[PDB]
Amino acid sequence: NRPNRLIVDEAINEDNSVVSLSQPKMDELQLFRGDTVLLKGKKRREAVCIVLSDDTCSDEKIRMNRVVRNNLRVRLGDVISIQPCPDVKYGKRIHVLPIDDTVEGITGNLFEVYLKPYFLEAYRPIRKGDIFLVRGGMRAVEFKVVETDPSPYCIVAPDTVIHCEGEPIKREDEEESLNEVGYDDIGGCRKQLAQIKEMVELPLRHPALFKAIGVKPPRGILLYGPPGTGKTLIARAVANETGAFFFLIN
Amino acid sequence: NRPNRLIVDEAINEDNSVVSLSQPKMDELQLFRGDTVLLKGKKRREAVCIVLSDDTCSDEKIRMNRVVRNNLRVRLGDVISIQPCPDVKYGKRIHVLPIDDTVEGITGNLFEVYLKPYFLEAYRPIRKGDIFLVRGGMRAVEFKVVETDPSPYCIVAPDTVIHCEGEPIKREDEEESLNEVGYDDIGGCRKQLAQIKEMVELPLRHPALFKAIGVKPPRGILLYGPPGTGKTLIARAVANETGAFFFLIN
Numbered sequence: 001n002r003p004n005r006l007i008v009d010e011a012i013n014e015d016n017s018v019v020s021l022s023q024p025k026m027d028e029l030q031l032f033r034g035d036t037v038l039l040k041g042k043k044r045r046e047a048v049c050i051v052l053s054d055d056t057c058s059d060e061k062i063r064m065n066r067v068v069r070n071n072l073r074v075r076l077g078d079v080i081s082i083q084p085c086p087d088v089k090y091g092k093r094i095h096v097l098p099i100d101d102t103v104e105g106i107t108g109n110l111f112e113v114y115l116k117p118y119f120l121e122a123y124r125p126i127r128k129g130d131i132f133l134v135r136g137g138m139r140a141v142e143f144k145v146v147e148t149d150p151s152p153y154c155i156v157a158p159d160t161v162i163h164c165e166g167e168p169i170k171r172e173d174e175e176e177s178l179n180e181v182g183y184d185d186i187g188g189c190r191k192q193l194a195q196i197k198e199m200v201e202l203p204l205r206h207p208a209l210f211k212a213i214g215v216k217p218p219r220g221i222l223l224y225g226p227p228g229t230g231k232t233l234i235a236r237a238v239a240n241e242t243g244a245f246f247f248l249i250n
Numbered sequence: 251n252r253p254n255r256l257i258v259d260e261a262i263n264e265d266n267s268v269v270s271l272s273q274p275k276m277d278e279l280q281l282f283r284g285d286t287v288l289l290k291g292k293k294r295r296e297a298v299c300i301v302l303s304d305d306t307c308s309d310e311k312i313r314m315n316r317v318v319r320n321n322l323r324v325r326l327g328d329v330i331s332i333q334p335c336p337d338v339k340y341g342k343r344i345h346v347l348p349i350d351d352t353v354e355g356i357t358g359n360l361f362e363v364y365l366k367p368y369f370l371e372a373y374r375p376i377r378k379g380d381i382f383l384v385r386g387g388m389r390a391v392e393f394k395v396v397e398t399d400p401s402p403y404c405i406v407a408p409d410t411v412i413h414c415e416g417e418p419i420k421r422e423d424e425e426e427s428l429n430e431v432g433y434d435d436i437g438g439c440r441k442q443l444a445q446i447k448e449m450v451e452l453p454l455r456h457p458a459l460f461k462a463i464g465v466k467p468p469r470g471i472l473l474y475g476p477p478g479t480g481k482t483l484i485a486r487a488v489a490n491e492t493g494a495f496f497f498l499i500n
Contacts, residue, residue, distance in 0.1 A: 105462025139464035 003028050005079050008069060009061035010183065012054055016132050017124045019082075020054035020063030031084065036125050036155065038085035039064075041072030043174070048085060048125040048153045066182050067133050073174070075243050076183075077205045088125055091154035093161045095146035099131075100168035102141045102179065111164060113137055119156045127153035133178050142178055144169060181237045188229055196221065196234065204242045254279055255331050258324060259311040260433060262304065266382045267374040269332075270304035270313035281334060286375045286405065288335040291322035293424070298338065298375040298403045316432050321380050323424060325493050326433075327455055338375065341404035343411045345397045350418035352392040352429075361414050364391055369406045377403040383428050392428060394419060431487040436480060446471070446488065454492045 003025070012020060019037065031037075031051055039047045047068050054063055062082070072080055098110060114134040118124070126132065128151055131144045146163075148154050171177065183193065203210050203217035210217045223231040232248075239246035256275075263270055269287060271279075281287065281301050289297045297318055307313050312332070322330060348360065364384045368374075376382065379402075380395045396419075398404045406412070433443065453460050453467040460467055473481045482498070489496035 105458075137463075 002081075004083060005081050006062040007060055008072070008074050008076060008078055008080055009057075009063055010076065011063040011065040012056060013052065013063070014065055014184070016065065016067045017049050017122075017126075018052055018064075019049045019068070020052050020057055022057045022059050023053045023055065025059045026051070026053055029082075029084075036085050036088045038083050038153075039068070039072055040081045040083070041074045042078065043073045045071060045073055045129070046127055046152070047071045047130060048088065048127050050125070066184055067131070067178060070176055070178060071130050075205070076241060077201065085153070088153060088155050089150055090157035091148055091150050091160045093147075093149035093163060094126070094154075094156065095148070095163045095165075096143050097146055097165055097167055097169045099142045099144060099171050101171055101177065102139075103168050106137055106139070106141075110141065111162065114141055114143075115162060115164075119158075119160075121158065123155050123157070125153060125155045131175070131178070140179060176240075180240050181233050182241050183237055186230060186233055186237060189234065193234070196238065200238055200242065204238075204244050252331075254333060255329055256312045257310060258319060258322075258326055258328060258330060259307070259313055260326065261313045261315040262306060263302070263313065264315050264434065266315065266317040266384075267299050267372070267376075268314075269299045269301050269318065270307050271301055272307045272309045272311075273303050273305070275309045276301065276303065279332070279334070286335055286338040286403075288333050288403075289318070289322055290331045290333075291324045292328060293323040295322055295379070296377060296402070297321045297380060298335070298377045300373075300375060316428060316434060317381070317383055320426055320428065325455070326491060327451070335403075338403055338405060339400060340407050341376075341410045342399040343413060344376070344395075344399065344404070344406065345413045345415060346393050347396045347415055347417055347419055349392045349394060349421065351421065351427075352390065353418070356387065356389070356391075360391070360416075361412060363387060365393075365412050365414065369408065369410075369412065371408045373405055373407060375403065375405045381425070390429065426490070431483060431490050433487055433491050436483055436487055438479075439484065443484070446484065450488060450492070454488075454494045 006021070006025075011018075019039070021031075033051075033053065035051055036048055037051050039049065041047075049064070049068060057063055062080070069075075074080055096115075103110070113136045117136075118134050126145055126148065128145050128148050131142055133140060133142050135141075186193070199218055199221065209215075221235075223234065225231060236246060236248075238244070256271075261270065269289070271281070283303075284300055286298055287301045289299065299314075299318060304313055312330070319325070322328075324330060346365075353360075364386055367386070368384045374382075376395050376398065378395055378398050381392065382395070383390060383392050385391075396415075433447075436443065449468050449471065473484070475481065486496055486498075488494070
């Protein structure tokens, strides 16, 4: 059934350009400790990252954060096809621009603050049309790659010309904002989210499952707790992670 | 950044014609024990006072009351440029006129009651356009320097003839009433004002910063204590001192 088709799960290493798999699964795919892979997903999108063995990971699941996950247009519980891409050479000219909803207030040398310490001997592989997030200046600023000289994908070299027009581009409809609330934005609810997610995993990801079976899915979930942890943020994150509709009643 | 540009801070000396500086700062700026200095600020205006040594004052700050503060049309935190002006000589004849909304109820010889004891061997350096305040007779009367013979600036000597044409003037737009509230009109609330100020200082003085930075400022502040302490007085003082708008809800 092709062992190259894996299920996207939560990541442990919160770095952008990195995917995590189990070592025994890496023994099946003949992969190495740091090979530039190629991730294909729904709606025909590719993303290039680096493979690292995560011992706490299962064989069927693959770890990746929200930044990479959204580039593949996939949610937690989807299947993606991974294949090694060793034909990646160093880049020359890379056209990149920030999004207007993340630079809405700040200005100046964004490169010195965000770009430079992000590729300072990092050799991160980026493909045309990708959106990477760099956290600096006490906020979050996203960038979308316009065009790279070794199109479509290439590895950023220390001798790579980084073009920056200085024009805050717009965000598209299908381009979900990384600035929203996800499971990587809530803590102190380890035991809670596990119970919550396993109650809303299947009935929200596969409606055909519960309608073809006699299992009765839950209709109401009550959250106790003192005002502080963020019960509002929990339900909001679930709807933005599973892709379900979100309508709040204050 | 020019070591002659300082920041206006709260005053210990409530005298109208005094500007307090730190000891080492006057050594860097070459100022004497009574040299008439020239202050410049926003809205392109000038003012003349007398520099003194303040041990409780810091190097990068300068103490001055609301009189000098309003004459430069600046608030606590604005930038001003101080410079030595040794070409200021004694005055000859000075024509000054009071404001209509500060004499309503009293009449007679204003010169002998307010003016004469106020400039009584004080050598106060006034300038055309300055608005100083004299308190006495269980009230407060505001005067505006209309015209001085040694234009523009001169020192009021106890031999200087002081003319009073007796003609009430209109109130200009940017002329904040000195009868209103300020940080120097409230007491007993030392640590209270200390906490309150630094909570609403930044978001009120620079809204642009918080709209650009990813830092959340306090939205709602509650004031405890028994009635009669002056709850409303504190709030209105902040708005009047920061230039921010004020709308009360009884």
